[PDB]
């Protein structure tokens, strides 16, 4: 009875949403029609978290699908599990954004948020006790970035004391498949900074690296990429829907991992992923999961934690397991890697343990890392944005649609302030206090 409302923005958001809803529909035992055909009684105990009850024992997702182009909604409706969605939750425009942030934020996206927010309020006021909002979008396009951030701003203004979760597909320096990505990526981080409680950075070249080295698939397509992203998305909120020995919901993870309100960018990972040939040579154990989860190959963002300091770490395990092994492994890694963890926080790692594993699996785990090595992503975005903006390339498409030139400079300044804040919290001493205390009061 802590409901989570799902929002999907853009083509990337809609495809990730379709795969994620297929994954948890199979997890809770729901056929594409909507009914329930399962084997355990613990599956319908907590199903109101994601599913609205319909007539005749049907279940529909509590998700809205929002787009500026009519072409994606056809493929989503006629996809694998397209029957389960309500037809009134598909909100689409008719003229596309054209990979433009100005069209998504001012010109075309401003006329669509008035129709989206009616459905959002309709499905947010019918809940019993709202846990919060979840968003799936990409910072490289026009529908996902601009109008997604506009929806974020309006939703945060309307519902202040709820939780806001974003899964943002940040751009890549190598797998950049759009010329005008740096403008859309630089103008969106400022709207992401002060209007989100948790943000998870997912990067396409990191997903491709996982599918090439760890999994060794022959053709790693977008179905596999969104399959991995859905694997990330399920294990964060499994503690709301399934019982366990130690529970940790979204607020419990955010409280422990966010020390300051401007530091809410996380890198995610999943644990038991193994190639087809190396399956029979490997045993599923808790030390194995903890050993392989902290691998730098496993990260779903293109940031190497060896270039920074782990500010905070969280791990959510799933399966029948002993607490002693979990606690001893997360003490052991902290005592071994002495320099990769910050020094003004003792015991940087948080543990959660759930009982019910994924279907057909014995044991699994999920990693969320708040690290200072995330500043190199913003530095690369800022350097490409500066390189383009010095010579004023592609600027008429943004300026002739209601934007003055000072917004780009303020976005650069805010990104530079964020990277300076991360650098100062990295290179900070712990055995010292100064310049704001009460001058050693009393005697």
């Amino acid at each position: 009875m802590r409901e989570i409302v799902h929002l999907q923005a853009g083509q990337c958001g809609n495809q990730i949403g379709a795969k994620f809803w297929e994954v948890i529909s199979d997890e809770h035992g729901i056929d594409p029609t909507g009914t329930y055909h399962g084997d355990s009684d613990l599956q319908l105990e907590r199903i109101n978290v994601y599913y609205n009850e319909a007539t005749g024992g049907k279940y529909v997702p509590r998700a809205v699908l929002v787009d500026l182009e009519p072409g994606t909604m056809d493929s989503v409706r006629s996809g694998p599990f397209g029957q389960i969605f309500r037809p009134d939750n598909f909100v689409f425009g008719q003229s596309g954004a054209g990979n433009n942030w100005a069209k998504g934020h001012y010109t075309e996206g401003a006329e669509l948020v008035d129709s989206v927010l009616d459905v959002v309020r309709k499905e947010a006021e019918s809940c019993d006790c709202l846990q919060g909002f979840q968003l799936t979008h990409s910072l490289g396009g026009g529908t996902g970035s601009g109008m997604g951030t506009l929806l974020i701003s309006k939703i945060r203004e309307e519902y202040p004391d709820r939780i806001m979760n974003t899964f943002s597909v940040v751009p890549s320096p190598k797998v950049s498949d759009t010329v005008v990505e740096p403008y859309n990526a630089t103008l969106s981080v400022h709207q992401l900074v002060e209007n989100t409680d948790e943000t998870y950075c997912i990067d396409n070249e990191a997903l491709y690296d996982i599918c090439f080295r760890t999994l060794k698939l022959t053709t790693p397509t977008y179905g596999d990429l969104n399959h991995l992203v859905s694997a990330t998305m399920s294990g964060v909120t499994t503690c709301l829907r399934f019982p366990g020995q130690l529970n940790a919901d979204l607020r419990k993870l955010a409280v422990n991992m966010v020390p300051f309100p401007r530091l809410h960018f996380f890198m995610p990972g999943f644990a038991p992923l193994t190639s087809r040939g190396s399956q029979q040579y490997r045993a599923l154990t808790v030390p194995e999961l903890t050993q392989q989860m902290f691998d730098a190959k496993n990260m779903m963002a293109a940031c190497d934690p060896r270039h920074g300091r782990y500010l905070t770490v969280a791990a959510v395990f799933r399966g029948r397991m002993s607490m002693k092994e979990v606690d001893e492994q997360m003490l052991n890694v902290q005592n071994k890697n002495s320099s990769y963890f910050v020094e003004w926080i003792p015991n940087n790692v948080k543990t959660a343990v759930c009982d019910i594993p994924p279907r057909g699996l014995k044991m699994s785990a999920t990693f969320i890392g708040n690290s200072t090595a995330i500043q190199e992503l913003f530095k690369r975005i800022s350097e490409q944005f500066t390189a383009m903006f010095r010579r004023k390339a592609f600027l008429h498409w943004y300026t002739g649609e209601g934007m003055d030139e000072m917004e780009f400079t303020e976005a650069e300044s805010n990104m530079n302030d964020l990277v300076s804040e991360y650098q100062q919290y990295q290179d900070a001493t712990a055995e010292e206090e100064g310049e704001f205390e009460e001058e050693a009061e009393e005697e």
């Binding site: 009519p70 072409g71 909604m73 056809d74 409706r77 006629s78 029957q83 598909f90 008719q94």
Partner: peptide
Amino acid sequence: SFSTPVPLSLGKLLPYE
């Protein structure tokens, strides 16, 4: 068939219907 509005639509078959 699905993406076209309710006005400006001929007789067409909606998906999954």
